[PDB]
Symmetry: C6
Subunit: 210 residues, 6 copies
């Protein structure tokens, strides 16, 4: 990553083993559950594109997902190249899409762009792209539609809701589309009665159905 020495300067560090291991475990244990994204994002704090490639490369298995991911990166790099078409000796060049994915850039270039003032945050840009791709995967790997999350007849409301919102987190839509109407619909009769009786916070709905 790039991080700040107790002096003041911004310097390149290696990825820790702690971070490497953390990432592999995440992927091993949690597949492409949604909470992988924030965990990836956190574990890639400071990351150069090189570090992001390292991280993705250490993922074995899920190679369909990872090819899908490469496709999503191609799309976003091509779009970057549309919006910013691209040389002076000594000076620092503008990065193409493929420079951001760390394909055509060297580490030094990547550091140059990131630590320059103002920064070209190629790490953060590539990360944005990877996270796009990771969302598409998470939805892909999502087993069940939110429509098929119905409260079991002997299912405590809380459990149902847990499933509801877990499932909902996996899917991709405007948070307008994601914004407690299907929650009530899919509730079981006993609860739906109780919930329909109110005009309500989730806290209220969960108390009411407890």
């Amino acid at each position: 990553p790039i991080v700040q020495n107790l002096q003041g300067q911004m310097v390149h560090q290696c990825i820790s083993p702690r971070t490497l291991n953390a990432w592999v475990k995440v992927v091993e244990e949690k597949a492409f559950s949604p909470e992988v994204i924030p965990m990836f994002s956190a574990l890639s704090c400071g990351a150069t594109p090189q570090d992001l490639n390292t991280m993705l490369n250490t993922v074995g298995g899920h190679q369909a997902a990872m090819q899908m991911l490469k496709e999503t990166i191609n799309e976003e790099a091509a779009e970057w190249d549309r919006l910013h078409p691209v040389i002076a000796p000594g000076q620092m060049r503008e990065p193409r899409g493929s420079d951001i994915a760390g394909t055509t850039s060297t580490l030094q270039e990547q550091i140059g762009w990131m630590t320059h003032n103002p920064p070209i945050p190629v790490g953060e840009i590539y990360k944005r792209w990877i996270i796009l791709g990771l969302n598409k995967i998470v939805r892909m790997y999502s087993p069940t539609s939110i429509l098929d999350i119905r409260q079991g007849p002997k299912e405590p409301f809380r459990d149902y809701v847990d499933r509801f919102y877990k499932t909902l987190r996996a899917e991709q839509a405007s948070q307008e589309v994601k914004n407690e109407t299907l929650l009530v619909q899919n509730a079981n009769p006993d609860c739906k009665t109780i919930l329909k009786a109110l005009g309500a916070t989730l806290e209220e709905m969960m108390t009411a159905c407890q």
Copy 2:
């Protein structure tokens, strides 16, 4: 988080140690009360971004986490009432709205600016306050039993009963005036103990010795 290098205050990444610690806490302890202090400790120094990171890494408990978002909305709206916010002065640092504190509408730089500025606007600590509010409501929610239903089993050692009593009591939300203890504790004691305890006019230490 924000922490101290030399002498200057600087942004660090969240450690993997901290991330893992938080996930484990939530995996192992659900929303047992001791999650709150553990969250608070593990979020020492945290920017709102770090707090979001932490909450995002929680998979499962998504009902709780939506409940949490609601509690944050309530407190942000109230913040916006108490501190209304033009085009800001160029260069200068703007007043944060509620949603800036939850790290929704602020950038990391803004968040750092507010926290490290002198005097500090401790957006990290404010958001943390809100999250902890929400976490308490959840802990009460996830609490299975009312303190009224904590009755000493007929073959239950007093100490165990008390452990349950106070564990259960910790889960519930009220002024410690309302929680103020050694009245329902005695009531709910089993006969053998209730006799012994009623005999005294007493510390918990004394009650536990007496019933041992």
Copy 3:
């Protein structure tokens, strides 16, 4: 905690996850075995009262013990307030009992008191109180009286002694009061052997009975 930067200044750090986890494990694994006290004391090296509260709060279960602990803290804070009753703008105020327990003080105050020269070691004072309470608990949680630690007829002396001293460690009295019963409670075969020596090191007694 408060600890020293490689420069020289005394500065506040967060509690490490390592320390948090260490403390929880201690309590999970060892309950209120006596060796919890020194382990708590070590893990609270440098601690502000805030850190001490954090640590105690992370203990789930043993809530009877922890209420008992709060009572012991009340006693000692009230006594502090007896011995030291009692504001100037800018200046640093004298801490009441409840300021030491971190109830009524802010972190800044706590740091102020501790890092001031001369120090008001509120961390160390509160720690003293907590350790008082922890001793009362350890005695409480102690199953057996030292009087009831009798060497089994087929029990190796060393085991007996191990039990003896473990049990003895749990109980609360001046080490004058703890400073005879080891020999008394020994089984006949050993008691003969031990009585044969002139009121002897433990090493000697354990060799003699081996």
Copy 4:
């Protein structure tokens, strides 16, 4: 490794136990699965040739692979010696192939070359060679040809693809994908896939 002190200077550190253990575990758990290469590369960030030797030496087992590896290093060192044939008192000498593998160089030389301006990145060069050898091994240890990765008749497309690309990784103009993937798909899917002109996302939706 060679890494940067909070001051600013470049200095030699020992390999951490964390790194050593990490590497051994990788090799124990993942054998010569492809993701070992990037994991080796990451864990050898900063490495002197000495550190690279250390790392390879700590691998017990897979001694066939490791001899194969030595052969690949010989080839690349000999080639280095062809392309750069090879002292002034005080001054720093040009490294032969065997100096890069850390066989004939001392640690000091290795540091000298790496930290000199401009750098002679013997660490990175040797690493390049090791990674060459590691690829040959990964292909060796690969059980199945991409030709023999056929979608089972009751195999979900995603699983098939996972196998396809895992297998493909073990073996990029030549690797260039959405031609043998379709060929080897089972009938039901091949129909559906042939119907499109397509991203993998699209193909996987279509076959789901």
Copy 5:
């Protein structure tokens, strides 16, 4: 412990949790096997007497051993007090430590640091450590199950195993390494088949004896 800041000065740190845990595990896993001593010594690198007390206090169980240990410390502190007797101290100045100051009983942490970091150092940490290690040796011998005399090579026991037992057992026992000075009782206690073979060589390296009996 006392350790050196990246500047240059010597400063007190807390004991790490890593160190605490390490010590407890050692004692849990390895009891009073001999390799506990060097492990204690290593884990107590830099230690103040306070840190040494902390470490010993975190040991639960083995309380017989730990009382034995206290006795050994009393003996050595009393002897210290004989060899270095100690008025009201000069104001400001640093006092001579009694035995009980070295065990961290009567000294404060500040005193302990003062003694250790002063030039020349009074290495109270290292002295107390010396005492603890004395006591730990007596314990290790105590907890040692078998005498070296009773380590006889089994009739179907490979020599190497026998030797492993021999020297493990020998390590547990306390005498001058003159008294421990090896390849005499090792041969005696060897089983017949080996004793023949070993006696055939002229009083030989251990390597040679182990090859010969393989």
Copy 6:
């Protein structure tokens, strides 16, 4: 060990618990498999002779091996004393030449050891002693090696790769004399030996493909 402070100076550190534990585990898990040597060498990066003694002392069990090791150290210290005999009473203040036993950390203090190592030019007593220990560790590894390379014959149902793995593992335990693809072919089973003999004495890669 001796290592470099982020300033620039060379300073003594304690051995980490991480390093101690690492070493013990290595020895527990891997006995005297050959890869213990490089692992020891790595874990003893920076080591004073004191640190090397610490490390060896923490090894319980394998006490035969460890006595064998002491013998190997005696041999090499005596030889050191032959090649470098020691000067009267030493110059006051000045740093003395180390005898063999000073290098094994038997007769030297830590300060002396640091003095020798950090002096310019360095007397690398750590590295010298390490050399000796590694000599002894090799003799042990060969000792603890169960099988001769001659007795590594490819099983009739043994995949070549496995055979080779055994071959070279075994060979590592025991480089002109070690120089290889001659006994490897000899000891191959008939089916493979045919195939391998067909190629003109070939890389190992080629031999392993051919026999796969």
